[PDB]
Amino acid sequence: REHWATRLGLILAMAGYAVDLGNFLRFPVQAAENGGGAFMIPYIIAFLLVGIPLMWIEWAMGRYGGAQGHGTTPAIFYLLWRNRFAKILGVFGLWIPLVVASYYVYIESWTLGFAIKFLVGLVPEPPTDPDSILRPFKEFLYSYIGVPKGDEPILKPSLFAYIVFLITMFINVSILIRGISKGIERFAKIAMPTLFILAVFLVIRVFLLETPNGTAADGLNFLWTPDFEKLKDPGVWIAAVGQIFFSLGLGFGVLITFASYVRKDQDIVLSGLTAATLNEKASVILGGSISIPAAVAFFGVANAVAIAKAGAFNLGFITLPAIFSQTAGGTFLGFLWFFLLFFAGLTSSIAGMQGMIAFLEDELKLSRKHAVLWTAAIVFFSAHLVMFLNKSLDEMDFWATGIGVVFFGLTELIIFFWIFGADKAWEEINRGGIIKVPRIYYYVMRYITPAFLAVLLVVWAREYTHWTVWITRFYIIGLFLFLTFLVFLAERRRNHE
Numbered sequence: 001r002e003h004w005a006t007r008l009g010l011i012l013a014m015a016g017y018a019v020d021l022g023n024f025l026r027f028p029v030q031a032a033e034n035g036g037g038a039f040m041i042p043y044i045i046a047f048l049l050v051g052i053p054l055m056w057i058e059w060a061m062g063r064y065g066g067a068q069g070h071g072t073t074p075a076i077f078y079l080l081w082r083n084r085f086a087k088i089l090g091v092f093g094l095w096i097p098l099v100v101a102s103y104y105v106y107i108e109s110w111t112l113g114f115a116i117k118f119l120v121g122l123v124p125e126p127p128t129d130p131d132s133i134l135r136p137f138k139e140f141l142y143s144y145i146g147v148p149k150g151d152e153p154i155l156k157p158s159l160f161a162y163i164v165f166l167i168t169m170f171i172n173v174s175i176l177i178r179g180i181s182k183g184i185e186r187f188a189k190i191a192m193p194t195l196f197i198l199a200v201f202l203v204i205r206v207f208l209l210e211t212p213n214g215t216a217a218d219g220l221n222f223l224w225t226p227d228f229e230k231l232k233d234p235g236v237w238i239a240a241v242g243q244i245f246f247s248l249g250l251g252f253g254v255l256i257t258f259a260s261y262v263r264k265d266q267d268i269v270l271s272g273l274t275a276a277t278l279n280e281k282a283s284v285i286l287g288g289s290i291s292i293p294a295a296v297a298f299f300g301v302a303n304a305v306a307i308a309k310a311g312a313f314n315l316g317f318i319t320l321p322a323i324f325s326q327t328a329g330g331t332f333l334g335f336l337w338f339f340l341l342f343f344a345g346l347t348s349s350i351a352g353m354q355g356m357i358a359f360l361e362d363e364l365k366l367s368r369k370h371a372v373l374w375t376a377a378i379v380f381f382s383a384h385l386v387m388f389l390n391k392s393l394d395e396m397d398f399w400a401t402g403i404g405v406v407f408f409g410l411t412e413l414i415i416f417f418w419i420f421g422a423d424k425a426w427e428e429i430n431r432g433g434i435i436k437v438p439r440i441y442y443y444v445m446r447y448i449t450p451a452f453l454a455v456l457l458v459v460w461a462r463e464y465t466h467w468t469v470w471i472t473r474f475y476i477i478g479l480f481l482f483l484t485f486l487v488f489l490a491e492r493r494r495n496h497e
């Protein structure tokens, strides 16, 4: 079996997975709409009661199953719980990341495309007034995506956007085809420093932004200013819990797959806590000091709520490029921005597609070349549903990463800590640990964490379309069935040998 080369590379690949666009865009927006700096109160709490424990558990299940040549949850859930239903539940942790991949790489391709467009100067040049600056970039993006002009739910992406997507995929394959150590890890040692560099440079440049409308200090002011009255809102306490899942990457079965390349007695306690911290520092320090400040600085704190309510996607693909077309040499800033975002995705999409690659290697005994190509061929095909069917993206994401990861996360808890047994699990986590997990986390992992996951699981089901959504539902259900069939073939090949 493949293994990570250096302890550093492990943490960087682990941090590379969790460090993403959401760090720079989604996190700053959620904080601004949920109490500013007061949002740190329920967020830090959720980082402690939910995010850290669940991460250790996936590191635990990962390493536990990796020692036996199995990196995926259809196998690992059967090792924690020898059952017919356990294999079926494990399919989700191979289904989820395959669904997300169908649309993540595509969104990743966009940043690559914009980075290229910005670098060569192929960007809109307005003109005065805010809607006079934003509209040229709102249209620039929509011509790239192919946003429907008519009533039809059909997207018509540019030939360029499509080609970059092939190129983007090709880039992903290159890294994945070289393996865990000479590929993902080797890249994680290049990307993460390069990432941090671009991040700091933008932070420095952003703090030097001054307009008649405001300064970067006003952005950091508005953003981090605590609104403790919003802490009364349960929804804020829910946004915090959902965000932790999102930021860390829990419930994607990727940590489990990635941790399955960690050696049997190698530390997973401190290493994970490091990668977890790298992601958080990336968010509160680097991320919340570029996007929100730069917007408030240019449009004034009088629009700060309007900008936050405009969404994270707008902030990074429409709002910030429009601001860069109005700054000194900002055509190159546009490039550094979309190139910062490209790596943030590439370090996460190589981690996402490994779950399928691991399954084809471990369970169907395919070579690494075939496992990588066939996974690519599957992702490339399914993305056409995302590229051409309007709102197909929202549908896949809602199920996979809105209900799916939260459900599957509570599944990992119960299977590893209630079915497999808490004591056997607790030992599995602490073993080989440089530092030992605090004795108090035994109770958190057993009650508090699955409680939080459960009471959240109740509200997102109580709180929550066209007809074309059935097309996407049809396809992604058909994915689950097909993956059930491969798990079935995997267990019929094993009885013969």
Ligand SMILES: CN[C@H]1CC[C@@H](c2ccc(Cl)c(Cl)c2)c2ccccc21
Pocket (backbone or CB within 6 Å): 017, 018, 019, 020, 022, 096, 097, 098, 100, 101, 104, 105, 245, 246, 247, 248, 249, 250, 252, 254, 348, 349, 350, 351, 352, 353, 401
């Ligand atoms: C974990 N937070 C980021 C990390 C990578 C990125 C991600 C996660 C899983 C996969 Cl399978 C892929 Cl391809 C990509 C992602 C997706 C959705 C939501 C959040 C995030």
Ligand code: NA
Pocket (backbone or CB within 6 Å): 018, 019, 020, 022, 023, 246, 247, 248, 279
């Ligand atoms: Na994150």
Ligand code: NA
Pocket (backbone or CB within 6 Å): 015, 016, 017, 018, 019, 020, 343, 344, 345, 346, 347, 348, 349
């Ligand atoms: Na990443």
